[PDB]
Design a protein around this ligand. Sequence first.
Ligand SMILES: Cc1cn([C@H]2C=C[C@@H](COP(=O)(O)OP(=O)(O)OP(=O)(O)O)O2)c(=O)[nH]c1=O
Ligand SMILES: [Mg+2]
Ligand SMILES: [Mg+2]
Lengths: 412, 555
Amino acid sequence: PIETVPVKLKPGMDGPKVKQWPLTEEKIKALVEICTEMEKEGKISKIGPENPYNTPVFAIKKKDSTKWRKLVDFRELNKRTQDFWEVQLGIPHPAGLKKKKSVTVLDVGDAYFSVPLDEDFRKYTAFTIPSINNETPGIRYQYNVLPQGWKGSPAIFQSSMTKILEPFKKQNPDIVIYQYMDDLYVGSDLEIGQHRTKIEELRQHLLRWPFLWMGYELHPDKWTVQPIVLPEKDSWTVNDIQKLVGKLNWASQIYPGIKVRQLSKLLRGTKALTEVIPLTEEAELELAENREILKEPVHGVYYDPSKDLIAEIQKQGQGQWTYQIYQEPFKNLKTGKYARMRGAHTNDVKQLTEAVQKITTESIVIWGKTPKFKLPIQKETWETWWTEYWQATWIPEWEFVNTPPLVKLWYQ
Amino acid sequence: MVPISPIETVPVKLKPGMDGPKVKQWPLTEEKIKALVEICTEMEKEGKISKIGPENPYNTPVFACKKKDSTKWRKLVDFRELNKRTQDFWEVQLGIPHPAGLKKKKSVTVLDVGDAYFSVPLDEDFRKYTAFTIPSINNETPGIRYQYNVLPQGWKGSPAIFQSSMTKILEPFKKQNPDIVIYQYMDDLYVGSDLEIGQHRTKIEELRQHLLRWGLTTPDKKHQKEPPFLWMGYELHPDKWTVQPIVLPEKDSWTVNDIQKLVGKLNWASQIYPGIKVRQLSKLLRGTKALTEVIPLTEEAELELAENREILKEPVHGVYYDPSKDLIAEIQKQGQGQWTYQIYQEPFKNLKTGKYARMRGAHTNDVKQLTEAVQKITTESIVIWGKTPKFKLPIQKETWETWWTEYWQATWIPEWEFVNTPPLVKLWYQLEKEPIVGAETFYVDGAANRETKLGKAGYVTNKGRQKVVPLTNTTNQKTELQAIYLALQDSGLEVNIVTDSQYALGIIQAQPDKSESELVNQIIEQLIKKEKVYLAWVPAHKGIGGNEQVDKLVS
DNA sequence: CAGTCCCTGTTCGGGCGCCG
DNA sequence: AACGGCGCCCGAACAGGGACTG
Ligand SMILES: Cc1cn([C@H]2C=C[C@@H](COP(=O)(O)OP(=O)(O)OP(=O)(O)O)O2)c(=O)[nH]c1=O
Ligand SMILES: [Mg+2]
Ligand SMILES: [Mg+2]
């Protein structure tokens, strides 16, 4: 009884044609059981090879969840419908969500299954379930309703979502609610008891209309930033000063006022690396001046909503992972560090996966975008294991880099 | 008026803005003429082919070969111009079934659907786009033109349609027989069950009659009821499997096309024959771009070929998959970037074997290549069995712990244990983390001219030691490596080296043990001889330390 | 600052094997 | 002399960043 909102690809672009990657036995069995129930409920339908489009599919389990969830990698289809969920039917991002004391994330993706999808667009939602050892050909489906993980789903459902949340927002005007992908971000300055109580009221508000029982809690007011810090030693050697000048010179690309004149004068000659060099009166002055500039904010650094977010991650060792978020080089909007995440001291890929998910969550809260990641890892290594540790219902863009640490810039 | 078959049709369109094929026929021999007029007459009475007239302004040639060592023939076509204008299909064939992934079944039957493509209908509105004439005489009768009512052989949409139509027909039978396994690859059907031999034949005939309702015939010509079964190019026995006999050519003079077929068969044989190498044979296929050019076998390529023939002498076999037992994968180093592995569940009962010999990157080490081999085995195992095997690796836990905790890129190996089988994988040198007290400090630098290709490389040290070496036909990157090489040559067992070359430092910090560069290999040889080496980087053109001093000498 | 170079990386298409 | 699938080893074309030169 609902008219399907017409959806069209961006002009000059064809649908996604991404090959399905191999799935483990438990993931295939989970997807077969899930797709059988969705097919019985009319959410999906089997298709043939005359549909040239295809999108990868796999399965995840959220944090502390034993229930399999179907996850479609709609990254290719999303950027091929970018003028729809950003230009035509966009969602405004509240600047106060990051200021709230507690923010709970609620999975509302199941609500999209009640709204039908445009018949002309259903062919672009095709996915293929593989078989173990290629016993059977690929089992292809396509969506009949708004699919989870497609950015057009919250955009079309926004009109329906607003009417559902309208009574709750009038009851609590101080609560900020933001919707991104399959998730709902609810922030308030209430106490931990009062917050979780209001979250349960919102759950009952959605019930009167399979992961709604979960609630991942955030605290953006407790999110810390990792500045560039300089070492403080009692004695300095030639090697210590060479590393210090190397770090300050790279830092000059961010802070133009950093000087290395009086420090480079200490290295006059061809001295042994371990020779102790006492800092002169001017060297203490220049080093103290550079420590204050690192406390001053960078000039002309602000968020541009028309530009993409970029995120770089560095493996610092011993469970330490630093990161920077920027739109223009050396204009970091945020810098941070993670430590002692799951997989620390045993699994780099799980830590990197955790770090990517944390950075993306922060970016959704602060700016409403997901950054494109520059991952310090080989492509084949990441593509072999990353799905084993993914616990999020969205997937950011990423690329792979290899930059040896010539100087420890973000973590001494 | 042709009867519509029970199989559902697949709506096939064409790319917008394009029409159908209009290609003239190809003059063939009279042997092909008397081998196709009888086919179009039999397919016309069976409804597989209808006759058209002047209202069909299309045409397509129809060259044809035979069948492999058999009596019959295979009518082929040239839809290369139709494929360019036909819509793209998404292939549902995602891989090739491997016998090592088959589980134990008491009873096994291999079927073969006769006339596979000729039993599946074509789209009604698409039959008009398949026109072709058949001249009864080579230059007399013009020949009445026909069309296709089924799937033609040679059309790019025929395989995808048959595989999808076959699945829809088997779906109701599989739902009524859940305990029966049906491996469906193209038209060949592998049917297995743990039922008794008598009850198994009963369900086979039930399946043969089920497929017969849609016009799919399973004749007794290629019906297999007893081992050994020839399935997917293998020999299936009740408790083991092996590859069909592989014949390697033995010519006195080897060309280029002969080696390409040789390495191809060795790659196909390396799935169950352990220890096959193709490094020195494939090395002969470099540079030469003439398939009909004789290539003499190198002494290394001859010994490699001799060792592969001796492996193929003793017959080998693989076992089947048992889900109740763990999956084990063991890797060995064969030297020169060559790795071989075996996947098994019980000791010396290999499911399959394999090799990894890819050389990626100009500079690498055994630890990186072992990591790449683990990833290749992991993905291959998920395809075949859907799980990652436990690894047995010839690298110490302490060695691996040092590499991954100190590397700047994220790297990881799944659950594994050490196996003591030389040659062990190790790191051949370790760069120090702090400068070495008492070791001479070498400030190195190198500069070269872009135009004349001339350059210099040298060093200055804290003890007054100094060298400048002129270089001819070089680059700035080569002189920076040469400067470090000079410092390693002219220093004691412990040395501190200060450079401004991000290029050189990035190569050496990744602890390579092999390189496509003779200079890097010489640097590696020196790094191994040392007891302690500390590399430090400083920015150039900043008047820093001795780096400013050595910069004046080389530039 | 552009425009090169040097170096190293990925992508792709074809050679071969194998299946149908 | 056809089509589709997978694997390997190959080379040419292309991308991208440090570093030097006008
Ligand atoms: C071997 C082969 C096969 N095919 C297609 C056609 C039918 C299926 C199976 O072919 P087939 O089993 O060997 O021949 P088929 O048409 O079934 O006739 P039969 O020999 O089985 O009676 O794959 C093809 O297009 N080209 C080929 O070279
Ligand atoms: Mg057949
Ligand atoms: Mg230099």
